């Protein structure tokens, strides 16, 4: 599973994200109490927003589609859903 941080202010609510998803041009499915995101290249993904942070869980990807490519679209999705950038990751690696 993938765990992403949350920006101070950014949306962290199912509905909020639901709008952000559809606002980006994506779809969202309600499977029980869990939220499902609808992105291109990916079959189905689970989203669990929390006041603290958020996390995503991917299943199987289209072997026909560059898993690395779909990743660029999958990350970008969360990237905007979180705000943090890959460049930010450095902050993590850079302790000193």
| CATH number of the domain where residue 10 is located | 3.30.310.190
3-state secondary structure of 19: helix
Distances (CA, A) of 6 to 20, 53, 63, 84, 91: 15, 5, 30, 8, 14
Print the domain residue range for 56. 1-96
List % helix, strand, coil for the chain (3-state, nearest 5): 35, 25, 40
Technique of determination: NMR
Cα R_g (the chain), whole angstroms: 14
Query: Which two tokens mark 82?
Result: 């979180």
Domain total of the chain: 1
């Amino acid at each position: 599973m993938r765990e992403y941080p949350v920006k101070k202010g950014f949306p962290t609510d199912y509905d909020s994200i639901k709008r952000k998803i559809s606002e980006l041009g994506f779809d969202v499915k309600s499977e029980g109490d869990l939220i499902i995101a609808s992105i291109p290249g990916i079959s189905r993904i689970e989203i669990k927003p929390d006041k603290r942070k958020i996390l995503v869980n991917t299943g199987d990807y289209d072997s026909d589609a560059d898993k690395l490519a779909v990743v660029r679209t999958y990350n970008d999705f969360i990237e905007k859903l979180t705000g943090y950038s890959a460049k930010e990751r450095k902050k993590m690696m850079t302790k000193d």
